[PDB]
Amino acid sequence: ALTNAQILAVIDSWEETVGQFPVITHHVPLGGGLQGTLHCYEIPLAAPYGVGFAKNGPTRWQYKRTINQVVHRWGSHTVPFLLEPDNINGKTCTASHLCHNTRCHNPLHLCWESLDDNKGRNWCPGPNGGCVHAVVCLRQGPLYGPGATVAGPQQRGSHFVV
Amino acid sequence: ALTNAQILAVIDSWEETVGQFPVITHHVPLGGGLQGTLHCYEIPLAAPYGVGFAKNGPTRWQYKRTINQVVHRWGSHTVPFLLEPDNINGKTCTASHLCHNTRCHNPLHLCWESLDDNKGRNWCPGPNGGCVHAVVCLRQGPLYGPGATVAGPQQRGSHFVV
DNA sequence: TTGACTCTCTTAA
DNA sequence: GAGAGTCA
DNA sequence: TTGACTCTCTTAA
DNA sequence: GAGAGTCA
Ligand SMILES: [Mn+2]
Ligand SMILES: [Mn+2]
Ligand SMILES: [Zn+2]
Ligand SMILES: [Zn+2]
Ligand SMILES: [Zn+2]
Ligand SMILES: [Zn+2]
């Protein structure tokens, strides 16, 4: 199996390639009526994507390296976390975009957490709006807000109490 | 069935049957260090469930009625909303548990909203902790909190900025 | 060894 | 969070 | 007509 | 949010 040195070499090659991705400046809500700036390193929309990268789904990619004649492959956003525990509280760790921009591979925009923690960031009020995530959000979640509920709780008769 | 009268009759028979489900009291976090009380009307764990009800999944049920000699069937939590639009902004409307208790069929604990709005209530701080849902939450979402993130944003080299 | 495609799977609403 | 079919 | 089961599907992380 | 196969 791959040694610590070899894993570090994979992480270094990945950072070197992703660093050359187009860097896109995005203005984003931080919460509390404030605006901030994130710099996303975005994988191209179509091939070629960069050395070692290939698209396996509409917004899914993989990173591949061949070491000592053995092909190794990882989810494209998982590479920064190859030296980290891969589960916690009995839940699989997932790459989680703090910038909510799937094409971005900036490791400063990623964290490594359960799928539930990951999803929940979609509704976070943001780092200036009351975020309580221990690994703080970089921005207000895209789905934060009052929502668009069509109908609320209601009854026709008198069979129920809240 | 097609007629408003037939729909109201479906809603009324559904409410009468559900009104006979056992009422279970649940004490719940509201946010802000406060606690409240909900009264859930819980479908039985095993057959028989009640007139018109049958289980199609571990925590999925359907309500069925014969109208004009034809069988009509609905997801068991959708019946209160049969007179409401079934989509919003091009997204399917879903029955959404404000009590986060799938067996509960209390319509005073249900709303009708997109799957995204529905999911997002899992992380809401709650009605006394800052909920901004226009149709207000009845409790703090069960997944609200700091999370259990294993690793935060990081880079080995100097190629990235936030 | 490498790129560019292909397929199906996980989770919890 | 859903829809629909098989049996009795 | 009603009940009690079976199966697969949707969505967006 | 994932893993793995095929072909050249
Ligand atoms: Mn995410
Ligand atoms: Mn829900
Ligand atoms: Zn980014
Ligand atoms: Zn947050
Ligand atoms: Zn309830
Ligand atoms: Zn809320």
CA distances to A14, A114, B40 from B69, rounded to whole Å, are 65, 49, 33
CB B96 within 8 A of CB A147: no
Q: Which residue has the tokens 């209530």?
A: B121
Q: Which parts of chain B are beta strand (E)? A: 23-31, 34-41, 53-57, 60-67, 70-75, 87-88, 91-97, 110-114
DSSP 8-state code for residue A16: H
Q: Smallest Cα–Cα separation from B97: which of B79, B116, B122, B75?
A: B122
Diameter of chain B measured on Cα atoms: 72
Asked if the Cβ of residue B35 lies within 7 A of any atom of strand E, the reply is no
Q: Which secondary structure element, helix H or strand E, spans residue A60, and what is its range?
A: strand A60-67
Resolution of the solved structure (Å)? 1.6
In whole angstroms, what is the distance from residue B8 CA to residue A158 CA? Answer: 15
Closest residue to F4 (CA to C1') is: A73
Overall number of domains in chain B:
1
Q: What CATH number is given to the structural domain containing B11?
A: 3.90.75.10
Q: Which secondary structure element, helix H or strand E, spans residue A52, and what is its range?
A: none
Q: Which residue has the tokens 């009625």?
A: B65
In whole angstroms, what is the distance from residue A38 CA to residue B105 CA? Answer: 44
DSSP 8-state code for residue A13: H
Asked if the Cβ of residue A49 lies within 7 A of any atom of strand C, the reply is yes
- Strand-pair partners of A65: A72
CA distances to A14, A84, A109, A140 from B155, rounded to whole Å, are 11, 13, 10, 23
* Closest-approach nucleotide to residue B95, Cα vs C1': D1
**What kind of experiment solved this structure?**
X-ray
In whole angstroms, what is the distance from residue B8 CA to residue B80 CA? Answer: 9
Tell me, yes or no, if B22 comes closer than 8 A to chain A by beta carbon. no
Q: Smallest Cα–Cα separation from B24: which of A161, A103, A138?
A: A161
AA letter at A62:
Q
Length of chain A: 162
Q: Which SS3 state, helix, strand or coil, does residue B110 take?
A: strand
| CA atoms within a 13 Å half-sphere pointing along the CA-CB vector of B138 | 23
Q: How many Cβ atoms sit within 10 Å of the Cβ of residue A144?
A: 21
Q: After which residues is chain A discontinuous, taking C to N > 2.5 Å?
A: none
In whole angstroms, what is the distance from residue B46 CA to residue B23 CA? Answer: 16
Long-range contacts of A1-4 (CB under 8 A, 24+ apart): A2/A67, A2/A72, A4/A83
In whole angstroms, what is the distance from residue A152 CA to residue A146 CA? Answer: 13
Asked if the Cβ of residue B64 lies within 7 A of any atom of strand D, the reply is no
In whole angstroms, what is the distance from residue B129 CA to residue B141 CA? Answer: 11
Say whether A151 and B111 touch across the interface (CB within 8 A).
Answer: yes
Radius of gyration of chain B (CA): 20
Q: Is B111 exposed, middle or buried (0-12, 13-18, 19+ CB in 10 A)?
A: buried
Instruction: Provide the H-helix boundaries in chain B.
Output: 4-18, 115-120
Residue A36, φ and ψ in degrees, nearest 5: -135, -175
Q: Is B141 exposed, middle or buried (0-12, 13-18, 19+ CB in 10 A)?
A: buried
User: Domain range for residue B62?
Assistant: 1-162
What does the DSSP assignment read for A104-162?
A: B--GGGEEEEEHHHHHHGGG---TTTT---SS--SS--TT-SS---SB-S--SSS----
B100, B113, B133, B162: which to substitute to probe chain A, counting the most A Cβ within 10 Å? B162
CB A15 within 8 A of CB A107: yes
Q: Which of A93, A104, A111, A137 is catalytic?
A: A104
* Closest-approach nucleotide to residue B51, Cα vs C1': E2
Residue B134, φ and ψ in degrees, nearest 5: -60, -40
A14's tokens: 């990945």
First to last CA, chain B: 56
